[model samples]
Target: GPKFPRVKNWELGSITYDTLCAQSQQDGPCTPRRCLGSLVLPRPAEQLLSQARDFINQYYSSIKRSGSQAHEERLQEVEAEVASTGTYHLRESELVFGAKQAWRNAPRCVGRIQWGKLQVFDARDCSSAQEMFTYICNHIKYATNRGNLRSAITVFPQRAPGRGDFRIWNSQLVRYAGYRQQDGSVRGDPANVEITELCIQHGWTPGNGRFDVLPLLLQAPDEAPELFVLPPELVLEVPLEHPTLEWFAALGLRWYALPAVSNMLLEIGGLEFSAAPFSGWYMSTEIGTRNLCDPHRYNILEDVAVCMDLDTRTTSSLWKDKAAVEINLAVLHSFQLAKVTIVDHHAATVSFMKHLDNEQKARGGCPADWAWIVPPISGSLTPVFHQEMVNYILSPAFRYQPDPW
Candidate 1:
């Protein structure tokens, strides 16, 4: 086997070796036979001594004092604590640094260029669901900032060895409730049906209409999850309308301002935080091409195609293509009119190209999931489509978690 994976860009005919992948403590699903690369959670260890030591070294190196007496002393303190307590904690500054690096190391996120700019809310002192709800509300208020979204992450307590984990049950902080109809039809977001039912089972009254935001199921360690509704004020929603089409305004489509993913596990220096939610402003494709056009979600493509009067009768018509373009346009225009921060696909992918170059210069290479890094729509049109990528797990990192329910 080669020491490292060689990466290539077909369009430009450039090649690179991912020397950074040797640092991955985790193994991806790929084998000599095939690469099941699309699935997100590629499954880590360490004698703890090595990982903890390595992380401290990274921290010191970041400050350009790699072998200073303070750095070596800090490493000693970590080993001393771990020998007694079986684990260690990060300093507040370390926690902040870890959160930003987690964002930087995310392979699926296209906005890593802004990774260094983030608000790290250290919520390790939180001890209950009510307290978590309060922190979440405040994070929403601050991050949303009346639609001028600020990238932020609120990390709860780290998972204790042989102890229960603190968890947020919902995948995202804000998700629409999905209702199962008697006739086997579904209403609202199907992706949230399981979570919506979990909320109802935990005593949340189900909403009959579409676009009802679900209550959070915040769980403290060893405690039953609690239901907490977001105050309507904290959740800023943008109503969709097109700049050109008057009828597009009547579609009754809307999306929330904040997109905080609440259920990811945050890992740093072999420390696992079972509940750390993080968010940034959305790229247009997530809303227009995924949530709206995806068959399992709103599935609005047919409706938009019909309204546009495209010949949906045959494959030659390219009806889905035409409708999806308008939908993306409407999302961009509406967010712009509402003054909400959102990036169009072109802008996001272009910035991502620059980020790749930046990372290459800094770290030799960047780990990226090509399928995700490429826009959901207009894959070939984006520069990333032609660029080969190497995907590998890195710490500090945010990882997908199993549904707590």
Candidate 2:
């Protein structure tokens, strides 16, 4: 009898790795010295690991070589100009190499001493989108406008995919198209505030006019859809949420494209669009690949696996049993709310209003369905904040800010 069961290899690998790594950390680093029983990799499994690495590497190489991979033209153009004007004649490769180096070596910034407490509340639990907004705005009170207050800048929609038309209504954090507030607080209109006619502010300009809410904003479409037209690969499945679910839908911009965006803000003549990487840890596939040790090699291994069925389906109850367990652990498991805090570069000043989720007591605590989602912004800043306001006369993030006329 056909068991009507199947196992996804990637899922298998992801779970297996977690378990193995977790166990390996028990005594010490798993080395020849730290070997423990049969937990050591068997010769075949060792070979398989090697093969997997190679497969993944080759896959990535092919993608790069195929020319389908997008290159950072902006970065290249800027670097070329820098080389022409400066005393050096560096190539685009040097700029990218430096970027890669800087990214890998970015200082472990210590900000929001109380930031750890911020994660206590599951974002899904906010009473209204306003709570999320107010939380961010309050934090921005102490944020540095000039020297990278990019961290802690983000937006939250009422629900998944942020599909509320916030920018149209509220333009609070929006910076790209400067509108002034009366009290020097962020506002959109010019004449009413302490300042005279408002001069424009600088920041990322999202395609949408709403700028303030642009950064950290995730647009959950009115209905959950999984596909996009331009640059392709921008897909998302709403209603279901998981950390990597929206990887494709994340602006389709590549890792190399960040610095140029930053320079755009810095180099503007009047009020041009500019953007930057937002946080300490961003949600990029490159960062995800970091866990694998060598991303290039992993892509190679994946390429080879394309030839064979990574998982050959069969009539096997065992597969069903395994999948069932994974689903439970991943979806049904619940985490309790510990605490919440808002952090600035200096200290964690605010504690959010109390509403903790203690999974132990809840009946419907666990989600009925499990989904894979891209962690919002991939821990990366979504650059749309001010741009959302700039992009639209409408956007939630775009609140007016205090500035001189």
| TM-score for each predicted model, relative to the true structure | 0.96, 0.18
The prediction achieving the highest TM-score against the true structure is: 1
Question: Which stretches in model 1 have alpha-carbon errors above 4 Å?
Answer: 1-4, 44-46
Per residue, candidate 1 scores C-alpha lDDT tens digits across 1-405 of 557888888988988888887778778898889988876556522477778888888898888999899999999999988888889999999988888888899998899999999999999999999999999988898899988889999989999877889999999999998999899988999999899989888999888878999989999998899899998888899999998988998999999988899888988888999988888899998999999999999999999998898899997899999999999999999999999999998999999999988888888789899888989889999989999999888777877778776
Which pairs clash in the backbone of model 1?
none
User: Model 1 misses residue 44 by how many Å?
Assistant: 12
Model 2 CA lDDT for position 138: 42
lDDT of each: 0.89, 0.23
lDDT of 1 at 115: 92
Model 2 error, position 106 (Å): 1.7
